[model samples]
Target: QPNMRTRVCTVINNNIAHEWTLARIASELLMSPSLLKKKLREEETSYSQLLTECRMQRALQLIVIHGFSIKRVAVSCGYHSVSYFIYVFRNYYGMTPTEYQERS
Candidate 1:
């Protein structure tokens, strides 16, 4: 079995990139949410922040390096709603996805 951090990182690197809840992540690891939360807390990271960072990184990487369309990048980054993706992305990075695409 993997250590706590490794397991968490594995989940983050693989499953979390695809849009999943903490409860779902816990389920995959066969642990309760509270237990996983405790472990995550020990690492000084929250699930929401981790997910946001992962999504942003994926979105930016796809847009800047891979030259993906804004909608395509948002969707592939696990955003069901392009509008919501635009909102969150604007909040985090201070620009819309399309703007980022152009600027980058």
Candidate 2:
């Protein structure tokens, strides 16, 4: 069987610019939302956590590779609030995106 977690990660990676609601992802995977949530829980993750992780990874890549502006990266990562994205980025990396970019 295809690894469901990998499938979810692929979907998130491919659709980084879109908000990833559980229902939407589940529907795309031909799964019911409840089943998908349960599967994720069994795997010791939730949709929200996975989405954040995926977004942050992409944001870091974009910052270093593309040299995208913080605001543009946040919006492209589906974060409507730049400040919120910065906060989450700091939480994930222990540094602001700008700092990360500058150091890299």
Candidate 3:
């Protein structure tokens, strides 16, 4: 079988700097939204899970190690909204960027 996750992840990483909805990604891959969702579901995952993993994980290194400001990291991590970026980041790491930076 062709690698669904491989194809999906490539598309994801290619556009990690842009907002990605299921419909948008599916369109990029020339797939139906539900078809893409179901294919990834077969791999035991979903779109946002992969998207969040890449986005937030890079965000960690961007802010913590790269000495990037939250506003900058937010954009680099595909978020134009710093507050919303912090919301998603806190949702994952259980702390705000400021706290995480301090803890770092």
Candidate 4:
């Protein structure tokens, strides 16, 4: 019933390296972009938020599990700027990526 967001997350999770957009995901789902946004809004979150969650969650694994560098993490998460990724990671996890390395 409430797996619409799950479907969106699955699609984003399936391809984290892509610079996905609402329109693109909607295209993949064969749904109009406007309607996709509506459905997502109805699900109580936007596609952008879901995409960030997918990337950030995987970014954590990439750093802790795979020991991937920040540059790689940023690139792999569809963030073109490592600086921005760092900022986002800090805000999301309450610590810098390097701090994660140091602590865990």
Best by TM-score: 2
C-alpha RMSD for every candidate:
2.9, 1.4, 2.4, 1.6
> What lDDT score goes with residue 1 in model 1?
73
**Which residue ranges in model 2 land beyond 4 Å of their true spot?**
65-67
* lDDT tens digits by residue: candidate 2, 39-72: 9999899888999999998897788767478999
Tell me the tens digit of each residue's lDDT in model 4 across 1-104: 64678878878988998888999899888889999999889878999899888888988887865557889878878999998889988999999888986777
For 1-104, candidate 1 gives per-residue lDDT tens digits of 77565675567668434766789778889999999899888888877777777788777778886657788888788888889989999998999988888876
Query: Whose lDDT is higher: candidate 2's or candidate 4's?
Result: 2
Q: lDDT-based ranking, best first?
A: 2, 4, 3, 1
Model 3: per-residue Cα lDDT over 21-93, one tens digit each? 8998899889999999999999998988889878887877878765578899889888878999899999999
Error of 4 at 104 (Å): 1.3
- For residue 75, give model 4's deviation from the true position in Å: 1.0
Give the local distance difference test score of model 4: 0.86
Q: Considering lDDT, which of the candidate structures 1 and 3 is the better prediction for this target? A: 3
TM-scores for every predicted model: 0.75, 0.92, 0.76, 0.90
Residue 61 in model 4: lDDT:
81
Show where candidate 3 strays beyond 4 Å: 1-7, 27-30, 65-67
Candidates sorted by TM-score, best first: 2, 4, 3, 1
Residue 56 in candidate 2 has what lDDT? 93
